[PDB]
Amino acid sequence: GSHMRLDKFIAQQLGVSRAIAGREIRGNRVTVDGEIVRNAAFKLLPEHDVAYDGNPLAQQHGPRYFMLNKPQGYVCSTDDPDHPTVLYFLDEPVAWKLHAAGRLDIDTTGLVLMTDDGQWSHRITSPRHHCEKTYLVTLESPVADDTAEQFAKGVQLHNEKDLTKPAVLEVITPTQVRLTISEGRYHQVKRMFAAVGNHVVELHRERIGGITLDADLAPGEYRPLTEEEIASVV
Numbered sequence: 001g002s003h004m005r006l007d008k009f010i011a012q013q014l015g016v017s018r019a020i021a022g023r024e025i026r027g028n029r030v031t032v033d034g035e036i037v038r039n040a041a042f043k044l045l046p047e048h049d050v051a052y053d054g055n056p057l058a059q060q061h062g063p064r065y066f067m068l069n070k071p072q073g074y075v076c077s078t079d080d081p082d083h084p085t086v087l088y089f090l091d092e093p094v095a096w097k098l099h100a101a102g103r104l105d106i107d108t109t110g111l112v113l114m115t116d117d118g119q120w121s122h123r124i125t126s127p128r129h130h131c132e133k134t135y136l137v138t139l140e141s142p143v144a145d146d147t148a149e150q151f152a153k154g155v156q157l158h159n160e161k162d163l164t165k166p167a168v169l170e171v172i173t174p175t176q177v178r179l180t181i182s183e184g185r186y187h188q189v190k191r192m193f194a195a196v197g198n199h200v201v202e203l204h205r206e207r208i209g210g211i212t213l214d215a216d217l218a219p220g221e222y223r224p225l226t227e228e229e230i231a232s233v234v
Ligand SMILES: O=c1cc[nH]c(=O)[nH]1
Pocket: 103, 104, 105, 108, 186, 187, 188, 189, 190, 203
């Protein structure tokens, strides 16, 4: 049930203070659905059509942010037509306006941030930025004892120029590890373990910057991000 004060909408649109927006509203320069509204506190709804001096002012719907626990078998973009996208799990209006601020392959599960705020998104996904992500990785074979050092110094991916930035590995079981990287190269985690002689069997993302996947969010479930999560992702 999105809505907002008519004075805040006008201040937003004209680039003025709320106090000056109120002056204009009282000055009979603002119309809603064709009728003059002189009340700065008028509750503006999405269906309303606002005009300033006769000029239509389309309503720019606020930005939305969601936390999704991505399941296997679905993809994070319409690039590939052979598999259904994660929008299948979202029950929101004009959901097609949403994109993943950091995509995950078809059988990788975990934290995906869905949003329609392009600036917020780029800040997180830019290849020039340092944003940490943590994954829970299941391997085909017991991790080699020099792999942590390897990842700490950086490894070279098959046919890539530069080494991977330092990454920290924590062993949970011999075939299950937690890995934190600050990059976003294509299929980086799988290629990193391949380079050192192992094979990723399962991959689950637990964190991105200051946002961690809720322990009780089941695969396929999602929720709006809190005001705090939005203001502190990275
Ligand atoms: O970060 C990574 C690495 C490999 N594959 C993914 O889906 N994500």
